[PDB]
Write a protein that binds this DNA or RNA. Structure first.
Ligand code: SF4
Ligand SMILES: [Mn+2]
Lengths: 343, 218, 98, 342, 343, 98, 342
DNA sequence: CGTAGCTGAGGACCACCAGAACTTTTTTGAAT
DNA sequence: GTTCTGGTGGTCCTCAGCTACGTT
């Protein structure tokens, strides 16, 4: 819960928070489930329909601690704080760096380097896992191509070059992704990619996964103090959460497509739940979306290890914590922002 | 006049005659009545505060409700709202009990004390009326105003008594003449409950001949 | 005048004379207006009838156990009343022919 | 100064007017058809066979809520009349005055003066707003005829003379009353008077208007305090509402037949509504009756300004205030009774 | 049930009434109880909560018969009439006669002669009935005085003289009245008349009786259309029914004083039911008042004969029938007003 | 405008799904106002919130089976209300010092 | 054109705020004290230890309703702040205008100009009603010298200058404040605006007024979408939360000091309504607090006319409009901020 | 904790049945 | 035909109570 990052991540639903002396107590239906100190904490994030003992609220407000309250799943509800601390300077720095282009180019090239690393290693593991019926040398050649592209992106200096060298990898990934899946390959196809109302079932279910990750990343930004509607690589525009999209593109790897292949394979999803209305639209059936959301929650419960921090956690906390490091970049404690990087 | 005991006028007429010399004429000669909000409230208070067949005493004084009275000198009969008898060896013994008591008339109403005499006159009659039956001398009166819930003493002198006598004489003359006069209207007939009868408007307007001739020539 | 006045009552039948009070209040209030829903009446009265009805009901009920509310809509009520359901009320200003 | 309370017309047959406290209830073989508060009524009119419980009539008589019974065509079958009240001054004055022929003339002067003024002014209103539709100069000639005649009527002395002049004015006004069918076909052409059977149209509406106006004038006069069956004019035929006829002689012209002409000219009624039996004179129709009564009760709520009293009052009160302006004259608060000179 | 002088009174309560053919029919819960022809009736008077029948209402109102509905105790409720209403020439005749001395004195003579005859005959009857407890000489002397006084009053022509004779007759009867009581003289003693605030017991009782009788007679007049407030002997003043007081002189003694003395002598009540007042006034108790009313109602059902016409009828119809005769005097074939000369 | 309107309902619970309709109607009407009596609420609204409430409440009830009445007083409602019994109502212009 | 909404004060300790649909309910060990609809509330203030349901905080934060927690003597704690709702260009403009001394000194110029104008004119008004109590001359004196500073403030281009001038307006007015009182001077410990933050009498009401005004202005500004308690004008020093109230430095001197002085002069608060602890702190009695809050709401309800267009406006809208105009200036439609000048 | 869905447990509110009766003086009563 | 007082049953109405869950 209490990560090395100075936040509290109480995620068990229907818990309670109360105050004992100078420490927080997590009550689990009227017995002392947990006890934590408050001497080194900086912010508290609370999931679930719960409460806080007003003594805890009063003790947190004075000593520069913000109490953020969400739902269980991760939607954003409210924030409690006195004379606001740690938002004005952070947001002003965000806007100042948004004005200039050199730092924006640096950050965007960092993100694209992370994405290409993730995809290349995903292909490496995919060809290692099942070396029976797969084009191994083709995937190796694509791997060398993306290694050179990774070096070039690390050698980038302008936004236009970054956009040009990003756009190239899309079609290569599209073809290799269509070749990637193992089970039910005959039954589902990925010949063409469409962002606007989609054709093919796989594209639509990618769209749904993208929307879920969208809501998650938006809440991830909102819970720390940064904006939503001005981005670094994507240009500013009224009504579009550009920073959200930038982080989406950074994390569109393991967290989205691996879930796609897992749902498609293992015969956990069937063709009876997918439909067609005159334009390729895949109207998700209610049972299909119920199973999808249950599977998403189950996956979020899966434990992994952070590549950078090293601390064991859930999948559901992977975005927020990652986004939180972004804040520690804008506060001057970090030199860069590696999501998945060697350095 | 059955035996001269029938040609009597009620004490309720005195207040009306004092207020709107037309109003007494409308009520007691044409025998008609009409009620508005204030009249309803007044009647309801008078009815609720009416508790006959019961006496209330405090060991020293006695109180009587709905006391029937009449006076031959003025030929005026009526009902006193409350009579208070006090114990002292000064007055006249009265039928029913022992000891010697003096009398005080009490009449409740609803409204602020009025700049004109009005209510006073009515009360005075009561006191004077009582002197004929309980053979004594009365020189005090009590008025209770329930809108302020206050109580005011009223002295009596020869001025008030002579005014009451003259008023009764003139009232009897008007009754014998079956005549309803006219008064200066002004703004008091905005709560005159008989405003839909006495018609203050036509009292000031032009003669009928001028209007008919006015609409005849053109 | 003929101002529109709305009367609602609410009596308690758990006490000694609850049913008697309910019967008497319903009979006393039905004398001036009509019934649109249970425990509500709407009437078209002058000021004097309103005062008389108020005095009668105030004398009849007992305090600290019942409730009575009197609203008045003024003389422009035709554009203030809206009905949706299926319990129509006869109005008393149209030709009123049976 | 009153409120012009409403009025109840019951048309469905075989009902029964019962009383529950202050409510009038319409029962029909134990089936309830409705109930109305009785403080919001003025008169209750019954059609056909409608019986009344003695308690109901006894309650309605004492609060000047009149009850009337009609068979099919507004006949005078039966009304209700209550007790007498203790206001002997007005009744003694009225009886003594009616015993004196000179005062009879001094009142009939104003009655007929108001009547002829009503006729003339309405004729001029009709002429000036209608162009080629009417014979204009004949209307104009009748107008100065009436205007000169009114001054002569104003100085009459004996009842017979006033009756003669009233008849002259009546014929000289019917002569042009026959001329208004402006916006309807020939079936609404006046062709004289028939008394007991309404053998034609127009009569079948004028009869209804006259009955519904008489039953209002009588109620107003008995409300004010007078007795309504002895008169200042007419031959005193026994047992007829003579004073009601006298007081209606003024608003009949401007309040009933003007209404029928307005109803016809607006084409609010169609000749298909009426029908006829083997002889059957002319009988109106149930939807036709409903339309007549709806238009009547709708017009009875127009607000005017009264000429003499100078107040803004509703149309239906006019037959009441006039009667009240009668009463005070008997007590001498005026000089002579001002008739309605709309 | 009974038809007297072309009128029809239905005195028994709860009997519906309807029309059949051209006849009136009485009913009592679907039981045929009476049939009467309507060829030669003049009015209908009801006493029950009947309601009549609308067929008969229309029939009579068309055939110039008015209907009057009362209550079973005689109070006036309503009058159904058509155009005629009947009483116009009668009321005009009353009003014309009310303002002349000759005719008013004639009718006053008619009333007073009946009064003195009834008083004298009652005195002589009581002398005859009871020997021992009577000063016979005083009563016989007063009887001779009253006979001479009646013969004199028959020939009066001036209002003042008739008023004086009435006063003298009243004085004689009053100075005789006290010894009429033959039981419970302890507190029941008559020593004068004081109508307003009545004093000392029995006086109040007498007053009450008069009031009831007056009201009864009042309703009687309204049955036929006589204007109850314009008298003949008594002069008219607003608020008082002068003609009722004129009429109820002849019926005052035999019908009120006899009733009171019967109540006193038969020990029908005791003085415990009268409460006290400080000035000497006397009032009645609710229980005593109700017993008085019940006794009056029961006595009203006594059945006697009619001295002038002979039909055997109840006491309760005496005030009406007489009143009817009064009406038949004003416009009819009556030579002179017939008093209630009852031995 | 922030002016007062009074809402009354009458839904029958003997029909097929009467209990559910009653529950939903009461819950929907309690959101925008205050309960002064059983089946009688009063509330302070503008035009837009009143339109929203009317459109929301028109669908929960069913016509030809229920009754619903809306009365509208005006912007000076302080002098058009009387209370006599023992069911006091909180006013929302009183400083509300809880 | 917006309309004012109410405010809910909670003083009972150990209560609980809970959500039900759109109603806020108060409980204390499952005892429903009352429920209030949330569509006609503007803010919610709580004393003591009161908790809220996270659904309620989410609802209020989404729908622009401000929750604030307080303790005994208005010691501010735990404001409820929501999220970023959009209009990003307005925030861009505001963030660019800061850290540039030209526009910053323009806005400081207008702010302190408004403050000085209000102080001077209020002092002149007070010496204008009743001149017998105090010395008019000296009061007039102060007036002109403040007027002098006015010219200087308009001829200013540097922020570092104005702070110094602040001290002058902070030392050329305190010398009048002690003479501001009229009645009960000896009882109320009245050492002028000599202040002590832990409270030393006749400053409890002053601090209470300041806290209420600060919360009100913070909510009014956040409704439009900007934060200015430490912004372009006020110093970068943390913990000096006054610029949000410096937007109301036009109103901090006026609407709070005037309120305190009116209560004191109108003899409506008695010295028994306060007390002091053992150590020396000063607190207010509960009944006095209720009286103060009732008076504050009643004053905030009273309705006046704005100088700009004259559309008839209420007092609680005084902060809100001052926010809204600050938007329109940053959109470039006007030239410079027009402050509130009475 | 909030949002729904099922119960039940009493009160409020009103429409039918059943029975037993059913009559009372005269004066007071507003007016910014 | 009313009017008042009991008795009966059947339907609106709100609260206390137990289960089953919270993403588009
Ligand atoms: S005008 Fe009105 S108030 Fe004046 S005397 Fe006549 S009725 Fe009375
Ligand atoms: Mn009195």
């Amino acid at each position: 819960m209490k990560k090395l990052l100075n936040t509290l991540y109480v995620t068990q639903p229907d818990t309670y928070l109360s105050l004992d002396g100078d420490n927080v107590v997590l009550l689990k239906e009227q017995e002392k489930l947990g006890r934590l100190p408050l001497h080194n904490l900086e912010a508290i994030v609370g999931f679930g329909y719960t409460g806080a003992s007003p003594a805890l609220m009063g003790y947190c407000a004075e000593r520069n601690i913000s109490i953020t309250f969400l739902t269980k799943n991760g939607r954003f509800l409210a924030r409690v704080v006195g004379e606001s601390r740690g938002n004005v300077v952070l947001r002003k720095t965000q806007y100042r760096i948004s004005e200039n282009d050199q730092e924006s180019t640096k950050i965007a090239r960092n993100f694209i380097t992370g994405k290409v690393y993730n995809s290349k290693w995903m292909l490496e593991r995919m060809t290692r896992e099942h070396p029976l019926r797969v084009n191994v040398e083709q995937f190796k050649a694509t791997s060398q191509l993306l290694s050179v592209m990774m070096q070039e992106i690390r050698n980038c200096d302008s936004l236009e070059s970054l956009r040009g060298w990003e756009g190239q990898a899309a079609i290569n990934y599209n073809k290799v992704f269509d070749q990637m899946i193992l089970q039910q390959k005959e039954e589902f196809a990925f010949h063409g990619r469409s962002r606007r109302p989609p054709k093919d079932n796989v594209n639509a279910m990618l769209s749904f996964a993208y929307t879920l990750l969208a809501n998650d990343v938006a809440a991830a930004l909102e819970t720390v103090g940064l904006d939503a509607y001005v981005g670094f690589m994507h240009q500013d525009r009224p009504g579009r959460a550009s920073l959200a999209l930038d982080l989406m593109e950074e994390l569109r790897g393991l967290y989205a497509d691996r879930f796609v292949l897992s749902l498609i394979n293992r015969k956990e999803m069937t063709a009876d739940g997918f439909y067609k209305k005159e334009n390729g639209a895949v109207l998700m059936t209610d049972e299909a979306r119920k199973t999808f959301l249950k599977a998403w929650q189950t996956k979020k419960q899966e434990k992994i290890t952070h590549p950078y921090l090293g601390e064991k956690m859930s999948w559901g906390l992977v975005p927020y914590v990652q986004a939180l490091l972004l804040a520690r970049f804008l506060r001057g404690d970090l030199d860069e922002y590696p999501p998945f990087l060697w350095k | 006049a059955s035996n001269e005991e029938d040609r009597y006028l009620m004490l309720s007429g005195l207040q009306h005659f004092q207020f709107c010399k037309r109003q007494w004429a409308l009520i007691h000669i044409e025998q008609q009545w009409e009620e508005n909000v204030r009249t309803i409230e007044g009647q309801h208070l008078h009815k609720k505060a009416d508790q006959p067949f019961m006496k209330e005493k405090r060991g020293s004084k006695l109180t009587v409700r709905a006391m029937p009275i009449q006076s031959k000198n003025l030929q005026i009969s009526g009902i006193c709202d409350v009579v208070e008898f006090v114990q002292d060896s000064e007055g006249i013994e009265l039928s029913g009990v022992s000891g010697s008591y003096k009398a005080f008339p009490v009449e409740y109403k609803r409204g602020k004390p009025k700049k004109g005499d009005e209510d006073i006159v009515q009360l005075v009659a009561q006191a004077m009326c009582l002197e004929e039956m309980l053979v004594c001398r009365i020189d005090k009166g009590y008025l209770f105003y329930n809108e302020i819930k206050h109580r005011v003493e009223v002295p009596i002198t020869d001025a008030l008594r002579d005014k009451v006598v003259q008023m009764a004489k003139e009232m009897h003359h008007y009754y014998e003449n079956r005549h309803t006069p006219k008064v200066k209207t002004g703004p008091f007939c905005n709560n005159c409950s008989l405003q839909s009868i006495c018609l203050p408007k036509l009292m000031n307007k032009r003669s009928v001949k001028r209007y008919i001739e006015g609409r005849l020539s053109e | 005048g003929s101002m529109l006045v709305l009367i609602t009552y609410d009596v308690q039948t758990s006490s000694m004379g609850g049913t008697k009070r309910l019967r008497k209040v319903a009979k006393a209030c039905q004398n001036y207006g009509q019934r649109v829903q249970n425990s509500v009446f709407e009437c078209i009265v002058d000021s004097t009838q309103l005062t008389s009805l108020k005095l009668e009901l105030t004398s009849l009920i007992d305090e600290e156990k019942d409730s009575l509310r009197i609203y008045r809509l003024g003389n422009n009520y035709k554009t203030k009343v809206e009905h949706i359901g299926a319990k129509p009320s006869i109005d008393l200003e149209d030709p009123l022919i049976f």
